Ligand binder design. Sequence first.
Ligand code: FAD
Ligand code: FAD
Lengths: 543, 555
Amino acid sequence: GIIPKKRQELMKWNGWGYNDSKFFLNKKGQLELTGKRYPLSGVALPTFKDWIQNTFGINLTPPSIVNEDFLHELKKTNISYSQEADDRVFRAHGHCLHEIFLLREGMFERIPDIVLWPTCHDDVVKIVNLACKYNLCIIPIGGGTSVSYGLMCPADETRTIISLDTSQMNRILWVDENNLTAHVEAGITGQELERQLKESGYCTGHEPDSLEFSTVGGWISTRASGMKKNIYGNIEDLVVHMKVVTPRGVIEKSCQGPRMSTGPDIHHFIMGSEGTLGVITEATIKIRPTPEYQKYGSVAFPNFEQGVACLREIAKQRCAPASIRLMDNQQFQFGHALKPQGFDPNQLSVATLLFEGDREKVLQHEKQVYDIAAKFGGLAAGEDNGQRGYLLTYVIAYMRDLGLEYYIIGESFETSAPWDRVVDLCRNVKERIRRECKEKGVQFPPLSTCRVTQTYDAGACIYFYFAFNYRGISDPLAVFEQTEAAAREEILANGGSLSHHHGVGKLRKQWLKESISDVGFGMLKSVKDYVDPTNIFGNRNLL
Amino acid sequence: GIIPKKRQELMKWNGWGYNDSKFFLNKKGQLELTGKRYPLSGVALPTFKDWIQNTFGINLDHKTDTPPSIVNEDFLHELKKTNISYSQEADDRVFRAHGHCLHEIFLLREGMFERIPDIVLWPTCHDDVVKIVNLACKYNLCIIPIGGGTSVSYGLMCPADETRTIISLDTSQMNRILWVDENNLTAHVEAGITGQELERQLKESGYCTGHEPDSLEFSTVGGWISTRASGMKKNIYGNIEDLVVHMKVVTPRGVIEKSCQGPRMSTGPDIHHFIMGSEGTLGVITEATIKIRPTPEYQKYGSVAFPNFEQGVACLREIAKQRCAPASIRLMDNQQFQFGHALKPQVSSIFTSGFDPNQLSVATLLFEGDREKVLQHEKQVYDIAAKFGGLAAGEDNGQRGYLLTYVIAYMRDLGLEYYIIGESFETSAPWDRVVDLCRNVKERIRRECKEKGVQFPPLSTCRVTQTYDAGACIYFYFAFNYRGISDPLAVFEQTEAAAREEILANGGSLSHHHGVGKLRKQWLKESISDVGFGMLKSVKDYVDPTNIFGNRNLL
Ligand SMILES: Cc1cc2nc3c(=O)[nH]c(=O)nc-3n(C[C@H](O)[C@H](O)[C@H](O)COP(=O)(O)OP(=O)(O)OC[C@H]3O[C@@H](n4cnc5c(N)ncnc54)[C@H](O)[C@@H]3O)c2cc1C
Ligand SMILES: Cc1cc2nc3c(=O)[nH]c(=O)nc-3n(C[C@H](O)[C@H](O)[C@H](O)COP(=O)(O)OP(=O)(O)OC[C@H]3O[C@@H](n4cnc5c(N)ncnc54)[C@H](O)[C@@H]3O)c2cc1C
């Protein structure tokens, strides 16, 4: 689960995930994931082609500019580095639709000049000192899974850009079994973190969909949320200590107390800072005994609003399972179409459930959730509709690359909102997307779908997928990017936030001042200007 | 539950709480609380005197102007036009010149403060606040906001060499519930509403916050946010940082507010955390939205005795490991067990003084929620406790323990009448440090007091008041008989600062909830790092570049 230095030997240079995993038609004419990595790898999907054809109407480098004296001092440190075109281009992007285009079909305007692979905190201190001495710009990179343009190099940045790659700084340093805390280097991936903890009988439970590649430091930088936050917390509840290298010096608290009142919480000044302040090198995270048992479930509702009302009541009774997601009809069908073999079926909606903990407790909780559900017309729909909509989740981004081969472009986007705004926001956003697409000359009605993906006391996270068959469309990116920007306007007009988890990066910068207020924005600026006065950390995210 | 403008008409000018509530000796010579407000009010406490005689070595027979208001005439003229209520009276200013640290109360009892507010203003809304901070910019004034006046960190004290006119900006008349949103289970409130009045008014609608810090009769929303307050039932309701969904803050730079009411976002560093724990140094928190819950169906008290404190700590740790802490669980050492016992009804004889009765520790429990869930959870928790030698010690004992928390602060004022000085202090620490930290802190206090010439061994006692996944909050009480000692305040303050050294050397935090104020400033940089100190400074310099908010807490 360690990312090798030459990423492209294992990962796709032009898309998501591993080289050995891509959808193909098997010898029975049916979509199938290549390779052996996933529970769905090698599993025929006999209705997936039918669903895709129905849904979309288809048949089926810049030179390296680097100071010689800097390079001389770098050689003395014995830190590994590269000026090769493939290494630099690989770290010049995340996973936004726009970037993945430039990467398949052209070239970016600016890419890092040099890649460095520090293996520890001290190496990071060396590199930030060199950047001060030689006037260099640093863009940190972990998993490279940003969906906010947070890795894109500014077109007019004229300094040498270092891509400071954290993927070789990836060890668990200590596991404290008395306090259930693990102290880890920040380049460790979710997958490798969980694998090594599980050999001791522990987990963190933090499971964002990008966990095979995304890193501890990246989660802290972007305020990451994982599928099971209902039991384990999101990144801000999980982290108890961190250590950060900035050009001003090293930020670290002197104790590992679980909660303190010692002024404004400086951990919150670093969480969500998106690579703009320094490098998070190590963090202490809460750990838990691995649960004894897991069960998936699902519930059908006669429509979406009944489902949303049921999720709301579950959150009011504070008895959410490990994960509870509510899919609208299109998303459900997407799922139903993906099996390996009453209620009006047009508005019929489906919640998927995941329970984990002790066997006897799990089965007791499962009963309670189905009883709350019955009050809203909800009927149990089975583990496999459950089991499968969550085996599904690590594969959806492999589907996006398949669409591009067939002239389909799609992206997801998200928001959080008060409970009382969820139904209208979902309906109005989906309709805004349909309206814009028609107005922009999109021939076929787009895929425009939502799910409720997390529940909170005060409201929910809502996740949208938007995609269309771009047949007969001149400029399919510009249509798509205008339509995304429009949906965000619609989100914010309906009381939703700028982002629940993806973050702001450079994609949503233009709305930030309005979201956090002028003085709010002025405060983020003031911390930046103190900690990094010469803007070494210049990816220009946020501000 | 609204604090009136002239506080001294209802509240003690020289101590904690209500004028109508104090301890006095009965017509039979038994200690008794006056008045009618608490469960213990008008209840004679026949053994309390002995306990005080035994713990402090005293008898209990042996008992024990203002600066001018400096204010610019033009300012005052513009203030008159706003119709904002104000006062230059010495008793209104003196009342707002202090919180509830021992030193301050001692100073109110035996003399005068070096610096007190020049004028007290009572805004009734966010717009009045905006007007007042505009005036302070225009006329170069200093503002110290005050809500309940319950700070225990010197957070209200006026800096002696502050030469500008100081406004005490009192929030107590800004106390409305602006809306209660039953769909989202949130209430948006003005920041001067007290805990007690907020809970009273929500309960009429079927709701509560569940945030119950021991000072809730007088401490306010704005205060809790400023100081990162923690309340008794955080295990169910959350501490202040989990409870706050939105806030509006007036600073000299302008108003800070997010544009939405979403429950969790990722829009950069969370600016609510720049404000929480700012202790009055950045601006005035005027309004805040807070989570609310239906009032619980049922509450159930309980208690459990363990063979010693260590076993009790190991049992709390297992309950935290199983994530099944009740709404409140507190473990008291043997000295607090003995104390609580000395508060009962029974009049003992004057001729009489499997568990060891003086090693035994006791935990008090409270569960609240739906009756069915409560009772299964109680059974779960008692099953765990038995594994550690725990024996159920009765619900009456748990209920009495809970009530007692609101009356302890009146006990402090009683000790002052009899030459006894005391204070509580607190920390948070990892699980693996708790037992050693408790033991070493208590022994440091005994050692310091002996070395400084205190005659009798001091009261030095502790309890575990909150469990977390990664550690616990530990609360200490320290008191001695200072009869015989020259400089009582210097001895106390020196022993207190020594204890804090011991806490920090044993892996405890600088504060779990009371905060930093001006009392703990000298450890702050070491606690949060030099760069983290610097980052706090940069926000303060941006938002308040002329230091209008000048109480000089933190930094
Ligand atoms: C298919 C897919 C599924 C996803 N699902 C989820 C999900 O469930 N939940 C969720 O929250 N997110 C999700 N994301 C978004 C992304 O995975 C998260 O934002 C994640 O935290 C990024 O981590 P990274 O290590 O990949 O960071 P990168 O992409 O490498 O960097 C993100 C930003 O952090 C900065 N940065 C990186 N590491 C450091 C460091 N050590 N110190 C300082 N700055 C740093 C970078 O400069 C950049 O600004 C998903 C993305 C994709 C493409
Ligand atoms: C007997 C006793 C018991 C206590 N128990 C607890 C407890 O269980 N938990 C706990 O956390 N604390 C407790 N405390 C501490 C104290 O009550 C809390 O810190 C409380 O949060 C302060 O509230 P207040 O309204 O009294 O604020 P004040 O003391 O009036 O103000 C505290 C600080 O906040 C600033 N301030 C006040 N209002 C605002 C505003 N609207 N905007 C900006 N700044 C403001 C002040 O300038 C001061 O610096 C206790 C104190 C006492 C004496």
